[PDB]
C-alpha cells in the first residue's frame, strides 16, 4: 500500500512555501502535499479532487463542470476569477477564458499554499496558491499502460514509460500520454482530451540535474460551463418541481475547445556545501474558442429588468421562463517565465543560515477576438418544457464585438533567510516587484496602462520540540494589481493581503503521523466596490476579512489501515463595502470537513485487496453577495475496491472500481448569484486496469 507512507513520510518534504527543500514542520505557513501514490489510489478526475481531503479549499464550487481548476482558498479567488495555479514553481499564467489545466495522470505531486505568498512569487491571490509537479524521468524503468471505462460513456487509454538511455543512467527520458472521451452530466454536452508529456533528464553527476519538461494537450470539446437559476435548483419552480441534474440550458450546437503547448526546463547545480544554483524556465502557448449560449436567470430576476422578451410576459409566466445570452470567443496567449535562484548555506556561531537570493521574470500576452450577446440576443427557454443557434449572424441590435490585446510582465527580486538557532527556526524575507500591464481595446482604439511597484515581506518563527510538536507564528503579505479602470479613466491601484497565523504542526520523526492546526486572520484591502454616488463604474477602498481554524490529520493507524481527513471553520465577511458591509461573500461555507479510510488485506485469501471509503461534507453557503438566499449543506460519499494482481503473477499491475457520490445525492454545489447555480456531480462508477511491464 504505497499511498500509506507517501501521505505520511514522503509528503513531509516540500519546496513551495520556501523555494528551498524544507520539511513541512519547518515552514512557517500552512501547506498540504498530495503525492502521486495518493492520486493513483483515489484516481481524481482533476487536481481539484486530489485536494478534497486538505483544509481551507473549495474544490467543488462549480459542480459537474471540469473546464477549469478554479479553487476558493481561505474565502478568496484570484483577480478576475482566474486560476492562481503553478507548474514546477512557475505560473500557468492565464487571462479571460484562456486558462490552462494539467491532467493528474501527468503529475508527480500537488502542493497547496494557504495565505499570502507574494514574498516568493510576486502578484498572487491573498487566499493562496497551487503548485503542481510534473512526472520526472525515473531511476528504475517503468512500462505502464492503463485503461478506464465508466458511467456517462467514459473511456480512457493511458501510458507512462521511463528509462535510462546509457548504462550509468546519466541520460533518462519519460513519456506519459492519454486519450479520454466522455459525456458530460448535462444532455448533449461531451468531453475530449488528448495529452502527451515528453521529458528528458541529464544527470552527469550526483550534484547536477538538467531536466527538459514539455506538455501538449488538445481538447476538441471541454464540456458544460453553463449557468442555471436558483428557481428550479435550490428552490422549486412555481410548479413545485425542479430542473433535472442533467439539465442543459445551452444550444445544441454549443462548442468549447482548448489547446496547450509548453516547453521548458528545471536546472540545479550544487557547487559545494555553501552554494547551490537553480533555474526554472517555461515557454507556453494556450488557445481557447467557444460558441456558448448560457443562462441569465428567470424573468422575475432583477438581472433581467431591461429585457424586452421578459417584460412582454405575464407576471404568472416570468418565474418559469429563462432568459439566456451568448458568447463567441477566440483567444491565443503566449507566456514565458524564468526564475533564477542562488542558495547560500553558512553559519554565524550558533546560528545556521540558508540564504536564498533570486530574480523572477514573467511575461504574458493574450489576444481576445470575441462577440457578446446582450439582452434579448437569444430566445427564452420555457422551464416547463434542444435546437441550434446562429452564432455567425451577429445582430447589431442586441450583440457586439470584444477585441482586446492584454499584456502583463513582472520582474521580482527577492531575499529569504531560514536561520536556525538550536530548536528556534526564524524565516524572514522580502520581495520587490515591478508589475506592468497594457490593454489595447482594438474597437475603441484606446490603451490602458499601469506600472506597479510593490514590496511584500514575510516573518515567521517555528519552535521545534524533540517529540515532533512544532508551534509556529507568521505575518505574511500579498498584492494583486487591478485590471479595472475607474470613473477618472485610470487603472485602479492594487489590492493587498495581510495575514497573521498561529498554529502547531505535529510531525514526529518516529511515527507515521502528520497532524496540523492553524488559526488565522486574513484581510484583503483595496477591494473594488459599488460607487456610492451611483454609476456603471466601481470605486476602490473596500475590505474583506477571513478568520478561521484549519485542521488536517494523516496517519498510518495499523499496517493495513490508513486515514486522511480535515476540518475547516471559515468566518468571511465584508468589513468595508458600499452595498455588502457585514455580509458573507457567496460560495463560502462556515463549515467544511472530510474523512477517508482504507483497509488493505495482506495475509488470508483476500491478500492484496484494498477497500476504501470516504465522506466529504460542505456546510451551507450564501448564493449571492446580497445574502438574499442560502445554499443547503450536503455530504457526499466515495468508495473504492482495488486488487493487486501480484498473487496472479503480475506484480505492479492492479484493477480497481471507483464510486463517486455513492448514495447519488442531488445537490446544488453552489451559487455565485440568483442566476448562477451549479448542480453537483451525480454518482459516478469507474473501472480502471493499470498494467506494469
Amino acid at each position: 500500500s504505497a499511498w500509506g507512507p507517501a501521505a505520511t513520510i514522503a509528503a513531509r518534504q516540500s519546496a513551495t512555501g520556501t523555494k528551498t527543500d524544507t520539511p513541512i514542520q519547518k515552514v512557517p505557513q500552512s501547506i498540504s502535499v498530495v503525492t502521486a501514490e495518493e492520486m493513483a489510489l483515489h484516481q481524481p478526475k482533476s487536481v481539484k479532487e486530489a485536494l478534497s481531503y486538505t483544509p481551507g479549499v473549495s474544490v467543488g464550487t462549480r459542480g459537474a463542470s471540469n473546464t477549469y481548476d478554479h479553487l476558493i482558498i481561505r474565502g478568496f479567488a484570484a483577480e478576475g476569477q482566474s486560476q492562481n495555479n503553478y507548474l514546477n514553481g512557475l505560473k500557468l499564467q492565464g487571462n479571460f477564458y484562456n486558462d490552462a489545466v494539467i491532467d493528474p495522470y501527468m503529475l508527480e505531486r500537488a502542493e497547496i499554499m494557504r495565505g499570502p505568498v507574494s514574498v516568493l512569487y510576486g502578484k498572487s491571490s491573498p487566499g493562496g496558491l497551487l503548485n503542481m509537479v510534473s512526472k520526472r524521468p525515473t531511476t528504475e524503468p517503468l512500462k505502464e499502460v492503463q485503461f478506464k471505462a465508466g458511467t456517462d460513456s467514459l473511456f480512457q487509454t493511458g501510458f507512462d514509460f521511463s528509462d535510462s538511455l546509457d548504462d550509468d543512467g546519466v541520460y533518462s527520458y519519460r513519456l506519459t500520454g492519454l486519450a479520454r472521451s466522455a459525456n458530460a452530466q448535462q444532455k448533449g454536452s461531451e468531453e475530449q482530451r488528448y495529452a502527451i508529456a515528453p521529458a528528458f533528464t541529464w544527470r552527469p553527476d550526483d550534484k547536477t540535474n538538467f531536466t527538459f519538461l514539455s506538455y501538449f494537450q488538445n481538447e476538441p470539446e471541454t464540456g458544460y460551463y453553463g449557468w442555471l437559476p436558483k428557481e428550479g435548483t435550490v428552490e422549486p419552480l412555481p410548479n413545485g418541481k425542479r430542473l433535472p441534474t442533467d439539465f442543459n440550458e445551452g444550444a445544441k450546437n454549443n462548442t468549447y475547445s482548448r489547446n496547450e503547448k509548453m516547453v521548458g526546463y528545471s536546472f540545479d547545480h550544487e557547487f559545494n556545501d555553501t552554494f547551490t544554483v537553480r533555474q526554472n524556465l517555461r515557454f507556453a502557448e494556450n488557445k481557447t474558442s467557444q460558441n456558448s449560449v448560457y443562462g441569465y436567470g428567470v424573468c422575475s430576476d432583477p438581472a433581467n429588468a431591461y429585457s424586452k422578451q421578459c417584460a412582454a410576459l405575464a407576471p404568472a409566466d416570468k418565474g418559469h421562463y429563462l432568459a439566456r445570452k451568448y458568447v463567441v470567443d477566440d483567444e491565443k496567449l503566449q507566456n514565458f517565465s524564468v526564475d533564477t535562484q542562488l542558495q547560500s548555506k553558512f553559519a554565524t556561531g550558533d546560528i545556521d543560515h540558508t540564504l536564498l537570493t533570486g530574480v523572477d521574470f514573467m511575461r504574458m500576452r493574450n489576444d481576445i477576438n470575441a462577440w457578446f450577446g446582450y439582452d434579448d440576443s437569444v430566445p427564452l427557454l420555457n422551464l416547463y418544457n434542444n435546437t441550434d443557434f446562429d452564432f455567425n449572424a451577429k445582430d447589431p441590435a442586441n450583440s457586439g464585438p470584444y477585441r482586446i490585446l492584454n499584456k502583463q510582465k513582472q520582474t521580482g527580486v527577492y531575499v529569504q533567510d531560514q536561520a536556525q538557532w538550536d530548536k528556534v527556526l526564524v524565516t524572514l524575507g522580502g520581495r520587490y516587484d515591478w508589475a506592468d500591464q497594457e490593454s489595447l481595446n482594438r474597437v475603441a482604439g484606446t490603451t490602458d496602462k499601469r506600472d506597479d511597484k510593490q514590496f511584500t515581506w514575510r516573518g515567521g518563527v517555528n519552535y521545534l520540540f524533540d517529540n515532533g510538536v512544532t508551534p509556529y507564528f507568521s505575518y505574511s503579505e500579498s498584492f494583486e494589481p487591478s485590471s479595472q479602470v475607474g470613473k477618472d479613466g485610470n487603472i485602479f491601484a492594487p489590492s493587498k493581503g495581510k495575514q497573521y497565523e498561529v498554529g502547531v504542526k505535529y510531525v514526529p520523526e518516529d511515527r507515521p503521523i502528520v497532524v496540523t492546526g492553524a488559526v488565522y486572520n486574513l484581510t484583503k484591502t483595496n477591494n473594488l466596490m459599488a460607487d456610492p454616488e451611483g454609476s456603471f463604474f466601481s470605486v476602490e477602498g473596500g475590505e474583506i476579512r477571513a478568520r478561521g481554524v484549519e485542521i488536517e490529520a494523516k496517519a498510518a493507524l495499523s499496517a493495513s489501515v490508513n486515514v486522511v481527513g480535515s476540518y475547516t471553520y471559515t468566518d468571511a465577511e465584508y468589513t468595508t463595502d458600499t452595498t455588502y458591509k457585514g455580509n458573507t461573500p457567496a460560495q463560502v461555507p462556515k463549515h467544511m470537513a472530510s474523512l477517508w479510510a482504507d483497509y488493505t488485506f495482506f495475509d488470508g485469501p483476500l491478500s492484496g485487496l484494498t477497500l476504501g471509503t470516504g465522506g466529504r461534507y460542505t456546510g451551507s453557503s450564501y448564493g449571492d453577495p446580497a445574502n438574499s438566499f442560502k445554499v443547503g449543506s450536503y455530504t457526499v460519499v466515495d468508495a473504492l475496491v482495488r486488487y493487486d494482481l501480484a498473487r496472479v503473477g503480475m506484480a505492479g499491475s492492479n484493477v480497481a472500481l471507483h464510486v463517486n457520490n455513492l448514495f447519488d445525492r442531488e445537490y446544488v454545489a453552489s451559487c455565485f448569484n440568483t442566476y448562477g447555480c451549479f448542480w453537483g456531480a451525480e454518482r459516478q462508477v469507474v473501472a480502471t486496469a493499470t498494467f506494469r511491464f
Partner: peptide, 21 residues
C-alpha cells in the same frame, strides 16, 4: 462593473463593457 468573463446585466451596445463572470 468588475473583472471576469461574462458582461454585467446592464452592459449593452452603447455601454462600457464590464464583467461579473
Amino acid at each position: 462593473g468588475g473583472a471576469g468573463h461574462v458582461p454585467e446585466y446592464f452592459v449593452g451596445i452603447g455601454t462600457p463593457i464590464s464583467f461579473y463572470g
